[PDB]
C-alpha cells in the first residue's frame, strides 16, 4: 500500500530539530518566564545550544574556582513558543533534551512538567497532555541552575546540547524502545546472522488497537539486506504497552571495527501498523561486532587482539565552551583517530548524541561513564546530593532513585550503538570502599544495567589501587564488576594481577602528564608536580612534566605495551579542557584557567606528545611519519638556558615509526640513528631509542640558526618521511590557514581557521604572542577564538564592543566560524600591529 519513499519521509518527520527561536535571560522573573504573551524585548533571541558561562569574563573570585575555569554560573530561563500543525493536533508529543546543566525545570503552558537534576544525562518528557486544544500556541519554559561549586572541571551552564521534538501517532515505538542483538555473531558471521529485534510499543489512545510491527535492515547509506519481517497481529489495549519481537537474517554482514576509519553501520527500519494502517516509522543505528576479554591476553575485537589506545575526554570545545557541535566533535575525534587512538572514555558523565554517533562512524570504542560520585559527593553542588533521592521524573519506576533512573535511561539510550562496549558506574568514588552501603550500591547499579543490557562490560575507574600495595575493602567493589579499571595504579599491577588472576584489568585513567604547547623546560630531568614561580605557569612540551600521582606518556605507555594482561589505557587527557589547571590547581590568584593534561591543546593544535603516540600507534605502512622537537629559535638567552645542556647544545628529538632517522643541520648530516627492535615477553614487536625509557632518537645539537631536517627511512634505507624546522626571523605577517575550502550552509556546520605569526620568508615565529584582530564578512558567524595558552585570561568570544581579537601563543591560534543558512561565502581578515594583513575565503552551500 505505502511507498518506501513515504516510509522514509515518515521517519524523517518523526523527529525535528527544536533548537531554533528560543529566548534567554539570566535571572529572569519565574512568573514572567512561564506565562503566555510575555514581554521578551528584554531577553536574548537565539538558537540553541547555548552555554551562557563561556561569554563571562574570568573572575578570580568565582565560586567555581580555577578548577571550574573561573567562569560563573547562576541561574537562567529559556523560553520558546510553538504551534502544532493542524495535521498533528491529536498526536503524541515528546521533547528530548540531550543535556541541560543542571538542576533543571521544564514548564509547558504554566505547569511543571518535571524537575531533572542530572546535568549531562539525556532526558525527555511526554508533553502531550500539557498542550493547548484547537492549535493555539504553547509556551515552553526551561529553568537551568548552575550553583557553584558543582564541578571539578568546566561544566558550562544551560542548554548546551540539542533539543529535539518527536511528533508521533498515539500508537508508537516508545522513547528508547528498540533493542537489537546479534548473540551468535561469531559463529554465524560467514553466513546468515540472526538479528533479534525488540520494540516496546505503547498505546496512548483510550481505544483498543490491533498492532503489527514490520522490520527491515539496511546498510547505513547503502542498500537493504533483508526484506520485510512481520510480527503476528495482536491486540494492544488502551493505555497499555507491549514488547514485539522478530528475528531477521543478514548474510555475511560487514563487521564494525576500530581497524578502519569508516566502519560498516546498519539501521533497523521499524514500521508500526494500527489496525492495518501504517501510523509510525522509525530507524535505529547499530552494527555487527563481537568481542572477548581474558585476564592474561586482554581484549580482542571480532577475533583481532588489540589494546585500548585510549583517551579520556571532557565535553567542552575550548572557545565553544560547553556548546556541543557535530563538526567540532568530529574534528576532535578524527584528530584522535589520526593519532592512533581507538578508544574513548566519556569522563565523567553521559555523552552527547554527537559523540556517540561520531564514535560509531569513525570506529572508536566507547566507555560511557554515568557518575563522578555516588551518595558522598565531591563538590557541594554536584550530583552526590541527588544520588539516593527518589526520582520524580513522570516516567520513573516505583522505588527508583535518581541514580537508578539516570543509569537506566543512559543504557536504554545507547544499548544499540556498536561503539559503546563499556558502561562505567563510577570514577574515583571515595565512598566505594567495600563497606555494606557501597557493596549494596555496586550490586544495585550493576543490576540496573544488566536488566537492560548484558553485552557490555560494567566498570569503574578506581585510584584506590595506587595506595600502598593496592589492597583494601575496595577489592570487594571491584569483584562485582565485569572489568576492573585502574586509575594511575600501574605500580601495583603485578601484585594485583597475582592476587586476582580472574580480573579483567585495564588502565581507566593514566598519565596526567602536563604540557604547554611550544614551551620547553629541563629536558634532561623528569619533573614531578613542578609549579614553582620559575615555571611561569607553563609546562614542558618535551613531556617531562607530570603530576605527583602521574606518569609521563613514555612511562604509562611502555608499561601498557609490556603487559598483555593490562588491556590498555584511557590517557588523561586527549585534549585540553577548561578548568582543572593542575599543577596550579585552585591557586586562584594565579592567572591559570584551563588544563595542561591534553595531548592536544584547547585550540585543536597538537603538542609534541601527539606525535610520540602516533609513532607508537600508527603503523609505518598506514602512515609513515617523523616529527621533530623543539623549535629552532634559540636567540633568547632565558629560553635557551632552561633547555641547553651543560655544553650548550639543544637536545633535538625525533618521533618516528620508521626504522631510522637521519638529522641534518643546514644540509649537513649529524648522523643516522636506528631504532632498537625488541619483543614483548609474549612476542609482540616494538621499537625504542638509546634505552627502555626513550621512544625517540636524540641529537645534542650545538645551536646554528637555519634548518633542521630529518629523513626517515625503512629498513632497506629508502626514505619514507621527512620533517623540517626552520629558524624564524622577526614577525612580518599574520597568515591564515583554512582546514576547509567550503562547509555546509545549514547554520550548524563550522570551520577552523588557524592564524600564524610568520617572518618575511613565511616561517612560523615559534615564540610570537602578537595580538591579532579579526574581521568577518559574508555568510558566516565568528563563534570563537583561542590559542590554548593555559595562563591566558583572554576572551574566547567577542569583546564588549563587538570586536574579535586574540593573541597568538607560541606563533599560533585558531578562529572558529559557523555557517549561516544562506549559501555564499565568508571572508576572514586578520590584522596585527605593524604586520602584513591576510584574508581567506571559505565557501558555503551544499552538504556532502
Ligand X SMILES: OC[C@H]1NC[C@H](O)[C@@H](O)[C@H]1O
Cβ 555 vs Cβ 526: under 8 Å: no
CB-wise, 514 or 727, nearer to ligand X? 514
Site map (CB under 6 A) of ligand X, residues 657-696, x = contact: ----------------------------------------
- The catalytic residue among 323, 412, 428, 688 is 428
CB-wise, 23 or 153, nearer to ligand X? 153
C-alpha closest to that of 527 among 555, 508, 507: 555
CB-wise, 104 or 512, nearer to ligand X? 512
Nearest approach, Cβ of residue 615 and ligand X (Å): 24
Of 98, 509, 545, 786, the residue at the interface with ligand X (CB under 6 A) is 509
C-alpha closest to that of 280 among 9, 5, 1: 9
CB-wise, 271 or 348, nearer to ligand X? 348
- Residue count at the site for ligand X (CB under 6 A)? 10
CA 404 from chain centre, in angstroms, equals 24
CB-wise, 102 or 106, nearer to ligand X? 102
Tell me: does residue 512 bind ligand X (CB under 6 A): yes
CB-wise, 353 or 580, nearer to ligand X? 580
Site for ligand X in 117-176 (CB under 6 A): 152
Q: How far apart are CA 523 and CA 639, in angstroms?
A: 13
Q: How far apart are CA 607 and CA 456, in angstroms?
A: 34
C-alpha closest to that of 675 among 663, 685, 693, 661: 661
Q: How far apart are CA 665 and CA 670, in angstroms?
A: 7
Q: What is the DSSP letter of 535?
A: G
Nearest approach, Cβ of residue 517 and ligand X (Å): 19
Nearest approach, Cβ of residue 579 and ligand X (Å): 10
Which string of DSSP letters, residue by residue, matches 566-635? EEEEEEE-SB--BS--TTSTT-TTSS--B-S--SB-TTS-B-THHHHHHHHHS-TTT---EEEES-S---
The number of beta carbons lying within 10 Å of the beta carbon of residue 542 is: 25
Q: How far apart are CA 530 and CA 537, in angstroms?
A: 10
Nearest approach, Cβ of residue 507 and ligand X (Å): 12
Nearest approach, Cβ of residue 247 and ligand X (Å): 42
Helix, strand, coil percentages for the chain (3-state, nearest 5): 15, 40, 45
CB-wise, 342 or 373, nearer to ligand X? 373
CA 585 from chain centre, in angstroms, equals 23
Of 100, 356, 547, 768, the residue at the interface with ligand X (CB under 6 A) is 547
Cβ 357 vs Cβ 779: under 8 Å: no
CB-wise, 314 or 713, nearer to ligand X? 314
CB-wise, 239 or 529, nearer to ligand X? 529
Nearest approach, Cβ of residue 393 and ligand X (Å): 27
Site map (CB under 6 A) of ligand X, residues 574-603, x = contact: ------x-----------------------
Cβ 413 vs Cβ 176: under 8 Å: yes
Q: Which residue is nearest to ligand X (CB)?
A: 512
Q: How far apart are CA 193 and CA 188, in angstroms?
A: 5
Cβ 139 vs Cβ 106: under 8 Å: no
Nearest approach, Cβ of residue 380 and ligand X (Å): 17
CB-wise, 309 or 551, nearer to ligand X? 551
Q: What angle do CA 662, 665, 669 make, to 5 degrees?
A: 45
CB-wise, 488 or 826, nearer to ligand X? 488
β 229-230/209-219 pair status: antiparallel
Site for ligand X in 728-767 (CB under 6 A): none
CA–CA distance from 459 to each of 424, 462, 675 (Å)?
5, 9, 38
Nearest approach, Cβ of residue 595 and ligand X (Å): 9
Nearest approach, Cβ of residue 52 and ligand X (Å): 24
Residue 532, C-alpha cell as written in the block: 614553582
Residue partners of 841: CB distance under 8 A and separation at least 6: 778, 825, 826, 827, 828
C-alpha closest to that of 159 among 383, 323, 335: 323
3-state SS, residue 366: strand
Nearest approach, Cβ of residue 314 and ligand X (Å): 8
Q: How far apart are CA 492 and CA 347, in angstroms?
A: 23
C-alpha closest to that of 446 among 432, 425, 426: 425
- The catalytic residue among 214, 509, 688, 789 is 509
Nearest approach, Cβ of residue 549 and ligand X (Å): 7
β 44-46/527-528 pair status: unpaired
Active site residue 428: yes
CB-wise, 401 or 551, nearer to ligand X? 551
Q: How far apart are CA 710 and CA 104, in angstroms?
A: 56
The number of beta carbons lying within 10 Å of the beta carbon of residue 308 is: 26
Site for ligand X in 348-387 (CB under 6 A): 348
Residue 511, C-alpha cell as written in the block: 598519565
Residue partners of 604: CB distance under 8 A and separation at least 6: 318, 331, 332, 335, 575, 752, 814
Query: Sign of the CA dihedral 212, 218, 224, 226?
Result: negative
Nearest approach, Cβ of residue 322 and ligand X (Å): 16
β 780-786/812-819 pair status: antiparallel
3-state SS, residue 559: helix
Query: Would you tell me which residues interact with ligand X (CB under 6 A)?
Result: 152, 347-348, 427-428, 509, 512, 547, 572, 580
Query: Known catalytic residues?
Result: 428, 509
Amino acid at each position: 500500500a505505502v511507498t518506501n519513499e513515504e516510509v522514509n519521509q515518515m521517519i524523517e518527520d518523526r523527529k525535528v530539530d527544536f533548537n531554533q527561536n528560543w529566548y534567554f535571560k539570566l535571572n529572569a522573573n519565574s512568573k514572567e518566564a512561564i506565562k503566555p504573551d510575555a514581554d521578551v524585548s528584554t531577553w536574548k533571541k537565539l538558537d540553541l545550544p547555548y552555554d551562557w558561562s563561556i561569554f563571562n569574563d574570568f573572575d578570580h573570585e568565582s565560586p567555581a574556582q580555577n578548577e571550574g575555569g573561573q567562569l560563573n554560573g547562576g541561574e537562567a530561563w529559556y523560553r520558546k513558543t510553538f504551534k502544532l500543525d493542524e495535521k498533528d493536533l491529536k498526536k503524541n508529543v515528546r521533547l528530548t533534551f540531550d543535556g541541560v546543566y543542571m538542576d533543571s525545570q521544564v514548564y509547558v503552558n504554566g505547569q511543571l512538567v518535571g524537575h531533572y537534576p542530572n546535568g549531562y544525562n539525556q532526558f525527555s518528557y511526554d508533553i502531550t497532555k500539557y498542550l493547548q486544544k484547537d492549535g493555539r500556541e504553547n509556551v515552553i519554559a526551561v529553568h537551568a541552575v548552575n550553583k557553584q561549586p558543582s564541578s571539578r572541571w568546566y561544566s558550562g551552564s544551560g542548554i548546551y546540547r540539542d533539543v529535539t521534538l518527536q511528533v508521533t501517532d498515539k500508537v508508537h515505538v516508545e522513547k528508547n524502545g528498540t533493542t537489537i542483538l546479534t548473540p551468535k555473531l561469531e559463529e554465524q558471521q560467514h553466513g546468515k546472522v540472526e538479528t533479534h529485534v525488540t520494540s516496546k510499543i505503547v498505546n496512548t489512545d483510550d481505544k483498543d488497537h490491533e498492532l503489527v510491527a514490520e522490520y527491515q535492515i539496511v546498510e547505513r547509506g547503502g542498500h537493504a539486506v533483508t526484506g520485510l519481517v512481520r510480527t503476528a497481529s495482536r491486540t494492544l489495549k488502551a493505555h497499555e504497552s507491549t514488547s514485539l519481537d522478530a528475528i531477521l537474517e543478514v548474510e555475511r554482514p560487514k563487521l564494525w571495527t576500530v581497524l578502519n576509519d569508516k566502519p560498516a553501520l546498519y539501521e533497523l527500519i521499524t514500521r508500526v501498523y494500527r489496525d492495518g494502517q501504517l501510523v509510525d516509522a522509525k530507524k535505529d543505528l547499530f552494527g555487527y561486532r563481537y568481542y572477548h576479554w581474558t585476564p592474561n591476553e586482554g581484549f580482542s575485537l571480532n577475533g583481532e587482539r588489540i589494546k585500548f589506545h585510549g583517551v579520556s575526554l571532557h565535553h567542552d570545545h575550548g572557545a565553544l565552551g560547553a556548546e556541543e557541535n557535530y563538526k567540532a566533535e568530529y574534528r576532535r575525534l578524527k584528530q584522535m583517530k589520526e593519532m592512533g587512538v581507538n578508544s574513548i572514555r566519556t569522563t565523567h558523565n553521559p555523552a552527547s548524541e554527537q559523540t556517540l554517533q561520531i564514535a560509531a562512524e569513525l570506529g572508536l570504542l566507547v566507555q560511557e561513564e554515568a557518575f563522578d560520585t555516588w551518595y558522598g559527593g565531591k563538590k557541594p553542588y554536584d550530583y552526590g546530593r541527588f544520588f539516593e533521592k527518589d526520582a520524580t521524573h513522570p516516567e520513573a519506576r516505583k522505588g527508583e532513585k535518581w541514580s537508578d533512573f539516570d543509569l537506566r535511561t543512559m543504557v536504554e539510550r545507547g544499548k544499540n550503538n556498536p561503539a559503546i562496549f563499556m558502561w562505567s558506574i563510577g570514577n574515583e568514588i571515595g565512598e566505594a570502599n567495600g563497606d555494606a552501603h557501597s557493596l549494596a550500591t555496586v550490586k544495585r547499579l550493576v543490576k540496573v544495567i544488566k536488566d537492560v543490557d548484558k553485552t557490555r562490560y560494567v566498570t569503574m575507574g578506581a585510584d584506590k589501587f595506587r595506595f600502598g600495595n593496592g589492597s583494601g575493602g575496595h577489592e570487594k567493589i571491584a569483584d562485582e564488576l565485569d572489568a576492573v579499571g585502574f586509575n594511575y595504579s600501574e605500580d601495583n599491577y603485578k601484585a594485583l594481577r597475582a592476587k586476582h588472576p580472574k580480573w579483567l584489568i585495564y588502565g581507566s585513567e593514566t598519565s596526567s602528564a602536563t604540557r604547554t604547547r611550544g614551551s620547553y623546560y629541563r629536558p634532561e630531568r623528569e619533573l614531578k608536580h613542578s609549579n614553582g614561580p620559575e615555571r611561569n605557569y607553563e609546562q614542558s612540551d618535551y613531556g617531562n612534566d607530570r603530576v605527583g600521582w602521574g606518569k609521563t606518556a613514555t612511562a604509562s605507555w611502555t608499561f601498557d605495551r609490556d603487559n598483555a594482561g593490562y588491556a590498555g589505557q584511557f590517557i588523561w587527557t586527549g585534549t585540553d579542557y577548561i578548568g582543572e589547571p593542575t599543577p596550579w590547581h585552585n591557586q586562584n590568584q594565579t592567572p591559570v584557567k584551563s588544563s595542561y593534561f591534553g595531548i592536544v591543546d584547547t585550540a585543536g593544535i597538537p603538542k609534541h606528545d601527539f606525535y610520540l603516540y602516533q609513532s607508537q600507534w600508527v603503523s609505518v605502512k598506514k602512515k609513515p611519519m617523523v616529527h621533530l622537537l623543539p623549535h629552532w629559535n634559540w636567540e633568547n638567552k632565558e629560553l635557551a638556558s632552561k633547555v641547553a645542556d651543560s655544553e650548550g647544545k639543544i637536545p633535538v628529538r625525533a618521533y618516528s615509526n620508521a626504522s631510522s632517522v637521519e638529522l641534518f643541520l643546514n644540509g649537513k648530516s649529524l648522523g643516522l640513528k636506528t631504532f632498537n627492535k625488541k619483543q614483548t615477553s609474549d612476542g609482540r614487536t616494538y621499537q625504542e631509542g638509546a634505552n627502555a625509557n626513550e621512544l625517540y632518537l636524540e641529537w645534542k645539537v650545538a645551536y646554528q640558526p637555519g634548518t633542521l631536517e630529518a629523513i626517515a627511512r625503512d629498513e632497506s634505507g629508502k626514505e619514507i618521511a621527512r620533517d623540517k624546522i626552520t629558524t624564524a626571523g622577526k614577525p612580518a605577517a599574520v597568515r591564515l590557514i583554512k582546514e576547509d575550502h567550503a562547509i555546509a550552509a545549514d547554520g550548524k556546520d563550522l570551520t577552523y581557521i588557524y592564524y600564524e605569526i610568520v617572518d618575511s620568508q613565511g616561517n612560523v615565529v615559534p615564540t610570537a604572542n602578537n595580538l591579532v584582530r579579526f574581521q568577518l564578512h559574508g555568510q558566516g558567524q565568528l563563534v570563537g577564538v583561542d590559542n590554548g595558552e593555559q595562563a591566558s585570561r583572554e576572551r574566547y568570544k567577542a569583546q564588549a564592543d563587538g570586536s574579535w581579537i586574540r593573541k597568538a601563543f607560541n606563533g599560533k591560534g585558531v578562529a572558529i566560524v559557523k555557517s549561516t543558512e544562506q549559501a555564499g561565502k565568508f571572508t576572514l581578515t586578520a590584522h596585527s600591529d605593524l604586520l602584513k594583513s591576510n584574508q581567506v575565503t571559505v565557501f558555503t552551500g551544499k552538504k556532502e
